Curated annotation (Swiss-Prot), chains A, B, C, D, E, F, G, H, I, J, K, L, M, N:
Entry membrane topology: Multi-pass membrane protein
GO biological process, one term: proton motive force-driven ATP synthesis
Residues spanning the membrane: 2-22, 56-76
Record protein name field: ATP synthase subunit c, chloroplastic
CDD domains referenced in this protein's UniProt entry, alphabetically: ATP-synt_Fo_c_ATPH (cd18183)
Any GO molecular function: proton-transporting ATP synthase activity, rotational mechanism
Protein encoded by which gene: atpH
């Protein structure tokens, strides 16, 4: 049990570096697709960011979901 | 059992960092495809976001579905 | 059995964070492809959403199918 | 047997959250490719949806095929 | 045998939720590529659908092939 | 043997839901690429289908090849 | 041996539903790329098909290669 | 040995349905990219095929390489 | 336990070099899509970077999340 | 040894049907990209092929490298 | 333990050559997308690099994160 | 040892049919991208090939690297 | 231990040929995207390379990171 | 040990035919993207190659890194 449930929480813990994969790709496109847009009409800048950030927010949200459960299995393990 | 059903809930728990993958890619496109659109016609801004957010909502919905069952297996385990 | 059928339902349970993958990618495109469309002709807005949402509905449907069977194996397990 | 055939139906059960993958991606494109089309010629709206939905129907069909066999192995198991 | 051949049919059973993958992606493009086409020339509508459906038919065909063998291994198992 | 060669034919059986993958993607493109073509020049319709179907035929062919060997291992097993 | 070489031929048998993958994708593009071409210049039709079919032939060829060795391991097993 | 080297040749045999994958995708593009080309300038037809076939030849070549070694391990096994 | 929970934390530790994957791809696009944009209108430079960096920030954020839990399992292990 | 080194050479033998993958995709593009080029300027034909073939040569080269070592492990095994 | 926790740190160690994957792809695009941009307006050069490098910095950052934990598990192992 | 180190060299040997994958895709593009270029300006032919071949050279180089170590492990095994 | 920690360092050692993957793809695009750019405006050459090389530098950097830890585990093993 | 550390170096040895993958794809694009560029402006030839080769150099570099450690584990094994 402390042999397994220990080592387990560990293995299973870090198998929440998948929370990087999905978003990592995503948000990075949003950023990319915004930075060019701004390049075109720079007086529209901000009107861009406001969403980028808005979006960029909860790309990063569902990675922390893991980082939460990553540490909640590690240092909050039951 | 506490050897297995423990370690199990753990492993199986974090194998809900797949909830990051799908959406992570998606919403990030929506954001991207909106930020450029706004770049083009900035008086159409909002008329954009209203959907982005609408959409951006339930991209993030079906990642929490896991985060729910992630923790429901962890701290609500039966 | 409670060793296996337990740990089993668990592992098998969270292997319904695949319900995130497919849709996650999809709907997010729909959203994306709509938000730009609206950017172009904003008086056509809504005439867009009406479908986005329509669609956006049952992208999210077949992820819950799992979330259903995710919890139905977990807290309804037979 | 109840050790195996049990845990089995379970594992095998949730490995029908693949029914999300394929369609999830698909229908979501259909939606996407329709919402833009409508953006262009909004008096052609409906003439679009009629198919979207038509299609959107049996994307969702072959996901339930699993959800059927997902629950038919679970609560109808032989 | 009933230990194996049972659990077997089960595992092997649900590993016909791959019948979702291929088609899921496909038909959904057909749909998508038709809905836009109709957007362009709406008096050509139908002349489109007639094939969509035609095609849309036997995308869904080779998913049921599995659903058939899915249940044929399950409730018709030899 | 009936432990193995049984369970075997089963596992191996359903691992012919790969016959869905390849084609599923393909034909669905053919359909898609035809439906648009017809959208453009509708008096060329049929001159399209004649091939679509021609093609659409033996996309579906090499999926049944499996469905054949799917059931030939199952109910014709040697 | 009949335990193994049996079950073996079976497993190894159906692992020739990969013959679907490669071609499945391919030919379906050929079909697709022809059907559009014909859409453009319909008096060039046939001059198209003649190759499509020509090609479409031995896409389907190297899938049967397996179906051959699929059944040759099954009902011709040595 | 006849337990292993037998079952072996079998497994290893059918793991030459990978010869389908690569080519299956390829040739099918060649075909596709030729059929459209001919669509454009039909008096250049043949001047196309001559290569298609030329190419189409030894796409199919390196699939048989396997089919050769597929059967050479099966019915020529040492 | 120190056999398992040790080796475990190790394996599981480095399986947080997935934190590189997602972002690695992403941010690198943002950068890319900005650098071109700037190429076009260089007096809009900065108005670009301000976001790039903004974004580029928390692409790198959800990789350190791991690097944190990478070292927190390693040198903070419980 | 003849149990292992036999079955081994076999398994390892056919795991040189990967020589199909890489090239299979490649050359098939070269062919494809040439056939269209010729479509455009047919008096440049040959001036194309000369390279196609040149290339098409040693795409097929590094597949046989395997076929060589495929049979060199099989019928030349040490 | 020194059997496991040793070998472990090793295996787990080099499974931080994934830190190459993500970035490897990324930064290389940024570079690529900048080099072309500069090709277009060479008096905007530098105004490009300043970001390239900026970005190119912390693509390489989150690969070293591993190289750090790569060696920190190796020669700093606890 | 001769049980293992034998079978090993074998397995490990043929797992250098990956030397096909990478290049296989690559060079084939070079070829493809040259053959079209030549199609456009045929008096520039050769000025093309000179590089194609140059390149085409050491795509094929790093596949033989394996073929070298493929046979060096096989018939030069230590 | 010398059984494991040896073989380990070996296996784990060569699983730092992933340092090839990421970059391999990348830098090669940078190169590609620069070589074309120079094709367009050749008096801007160098102004290109200066970055290519700059970039091309630390694509190759994070592959050696491994080659370092590749040999550091091999001939510097602790 | 000579059972393991032997067979190990072998297996691990050839798992440095991944050094083919990354680059194989890459350089081949550089080549491709240069050969076309030269097609366009042939008096800019060389000004191209100089970089191609420059680049083409150290695509091939980080494949030999393996070939080095490929043989360094094989015939320099410690």
């Amino acid at each position: 049990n402390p042999l397994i449930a220990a080592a387990s929480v560990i293995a299973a813990g870090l198998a929440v570096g998948l929370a990087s994969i999905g978003p990592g790709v995503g948000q990075g496109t949003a950023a990319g697709q915004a930075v060019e847009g701004i390049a075109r009409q720079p007086e529209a800048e901000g009107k861009i960011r406001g969403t980028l950030l808005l979006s960029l927010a909860f790309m990063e949200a569902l990675t922390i979901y893991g980082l939460v459960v990553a540490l909640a299995l590690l240092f909050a393990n039951p």
